[PDB]
Structures are given as structure tokens and as C-alpha cells.
Design a protein around this ligand. Structure first.
Ligand code: CA
Ligand code: CA
Lengths: 168, 156
């Protein structure tokens, strides 16, 4: 699969207090209209924060927008419903006016969809992954992507987990 | 007189486990008579003793956009639809304030989002907001509504 969803870090090292920007990116997802992803991190090592301001995420904090899903003509909506004590984020952004989107004949298929920040509480090796949730019954390793007919994309893409943070 | 029959399906993809729940419970009325029927788990309905004539057929279900089919001409036993080509019903005209408004719009989306990212064991979960009845309220449910965003009953 050269079609994929993944997370990329601007850097994979961090002193205590420094922020890593974690960007959720897609590649060649046909007629893409929205994502939902469930992410697991270690809350004693990393603190979820806004990637620009450094403000701590609460359990309703919203993911920072990327390149895609920001055309206001298609009526984007965004959601965040987390369990920060368990190190779980759940992020979702999507278009609602799907007929308008299709009428443009200009699908968004490759690029950035979300950005979250992670502040190092400890300088210590740690792992971030997309992770299955019971709240997402047919999730593909904790991801559900949709096309512009409003249907779930059920196959044909890879979920590429990010590299380790502060490995040595 | 005659038997009017057919198939109703919701307009979203189902599974073996969810289909029998979501295909059942559509009420099909022959307007002008007091004759109705409710679809079974295969989406099938049957109304007997219908008098010959021309009717509007009305289809309703909680949290679905009401449909009217005009000029249904009945001269003998008639099949309105088939299992391979059913009448589709659009989920996501939600009961808000104990009433649906016959439009699928942002308010319907916001109603679902009140329990976004929950599963059936959560106290916050409400089965009515789980449109595809997969036991979770997730982006799938929201995208089902988005399929017909900004539509009203006359758009069927
Ligand atoms: Ca409505
Ligand atoms: Ca659902």
C-alpha cells in the first residue's frame, strides 16, 4: 500500500519542556472527506498540548488543522473527545456538504490533516501509536477514513506508526 | 381487494448483525386509507385488502427523513420495490425537542455530537444517535447524515 495514513514528528528528540509537533498525514486516499483517529501515548512521559501555544489539552481540546479539510465551502466540523489520564486522544475532522465537495471536481487526497503537540515531561524513551478503540467498531488500527459519498474506506491503505521518541 | 408489498432499506452500508435491526421498523402508510404495515428484519412490508385506486404512499421512522411516493397506481397486487432495488430512507432527521423538522442539517449533526465517541456501555451513549446501530457513536454516524446534508423530504 502506497496509500497510507501516518504520523510524522518535526523532531524525535526533546528536552524536558520542549514540544514535539506530531502531524497526521495522508497519501493517495481517493476522494477523501474526513478522518477519525485514536491515539495512545504515555501521559507520565508526554503531555498533549496545542502545538503552537503549548497549552495543555483538556479532554475536549481540538486538533490543530493541517493543509486539508479547511475549505469552508464544504462545511468542515472538528471534534476531540479524550481520556488524557489514560494517554488517549480521539480526533476527528470532516466535511459535511458532500454534494458541494463533489461538484468542485477537486478531491483532496494527499497532505496534512491534523497537528497535535507533545511536551516532554521526562527525557525518556517513549512510543506513540494509532490504537484500536471500542468506540470505533470497524477502525483499521484505530483509524477510519471516509470518501466524498459519505462511505467508510474499508481497505486499500496502510497505517504507518511513527518512530520512537527520545530513543538514545 | 389487493396486496401492496415491497422493501425498505436505510441509505447506508450494513452488516449481518446490524441489518436486521436497521431494516425493521419502517411504517408504510397508504395515505387516504387507514392501512399501514411495519417492515420486518428483511425490510419487507405487506398491506392487504387495499382498494384499487391511486395513492400517495408515506414512509416514516424515528430519526429518518419522512418520504412520500406520489402517484402509486394500484389495479391488482402490486410490488412497490424489490430486495435488490429497495426504497431507500435517509437517516439523520433527528428528534430534537421531541420532534423532527423534516430537514437534515447542522442541528441534526449537533444532536449526534452530544454523545460523540461513545460505545453502548457508556452512560452518555444513546441508541437513537447510533444511526447504523453498530454499538458506537462515531464519525460513521455523522457521515451518514452528511450524505444528505441540507435536504428536505421533497428532495427524495
Ligand atoms: Ca432535522
Ligand atoms: Ca454507529
Amino acid at each position: 500500500m502506497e496509500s497510507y495514513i501516518t504520523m510524522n514528528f518535526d523532531k524525535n528528540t526533546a528536552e524536558v519542556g520542549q514540544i514535539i509537533k506530531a502531524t497526521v498525514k495522508i497519501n493517495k486516499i481517493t476522494n477523501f472527506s474526513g478522518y477519525q483517529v485514536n491515539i495512545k501515548y504515555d501521559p507520565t512521559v508526554l503531555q498533549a498540548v496545542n502545538p503552537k501555544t503549548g497549552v495543555a489539552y483538556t479532554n475536549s481540546s481540538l486538533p490543530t488543522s493541517g493543509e486539508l479539510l479547511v475549505n469552508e465551502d464544504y462545511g468542515p466540523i472538528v471534534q476531540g473527545v479524550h481520556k488524557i489520564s489514560e494517554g488517549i486522544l480521539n480526533l476527528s475532522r470532516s466535511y459535511t456538504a458532500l454534494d458541494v465537495y463533489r461538484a468542485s471536481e477537486s478531491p483532496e487526497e494527499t497532505g496534512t490533516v491534523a497537528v497535535v503537540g507533545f511536551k516532554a515531561l521526562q527525557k525518556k524513551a517513549t512510543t506513540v501509536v494509532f490504537e484500536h478503540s471500542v468506540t470505533m467498531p470497524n477502525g483499521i488500527i484505530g483509524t477510519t477514513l471516509f470518501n466524498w459519498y459519505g462511505n467508510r474506506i474499508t481497505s486499500g491503505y496502510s497505517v504507518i506508526q511513527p518512530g520512537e521518541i527520545n530513543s538514545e | 381487494g389487493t396486496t401492496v408489498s415491497g422493501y425498505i432499506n436505510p441509505d447506508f452500508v450494513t452488516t449481518s448483525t446490524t441489518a436486521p435491526i436497521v431494516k425493521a421498523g419502517f411504517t408504510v402508510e397508504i395515505v387516504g386509507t387507514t392501512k399501514s404495515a411495519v417492515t420486518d428484519s428483511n425490510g419487507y412490508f405487506e398491506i392487504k385488502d387495499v382498494a384499487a385506486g391511486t395513492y400517495t404512499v408515506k414512509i416514516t421512522k424515528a430519526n429518518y427523513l419522512t418520504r412520500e411516493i406520489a402517484n402509486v397506481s394500484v389495479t391488482a397486487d402490486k410490488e412497490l420495490s424489490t430486495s435488490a432495488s429497495p426504497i431507500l430512507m435517509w437517516a439523520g432527521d433527528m428528534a430534537i425537542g421531541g420532534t423532527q423538522d423534516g430537514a437534515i442539517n447542522l442541528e441534526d449533526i449537533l444532536e449526534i455530537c452530544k454523545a460523540f465517541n461513545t460505545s453502548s456501555t457508556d452512560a452518555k451513549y444513546q441508541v437513537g444517535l447510533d444511526l447504523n446501530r453498530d454499538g458506537a457513536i462515531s464519525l460513521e454516524d455523522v457521515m451518514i447524515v452528511a450524505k444528505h446534508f441540507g435536504k428536505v423530504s421533497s428532495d427524495y
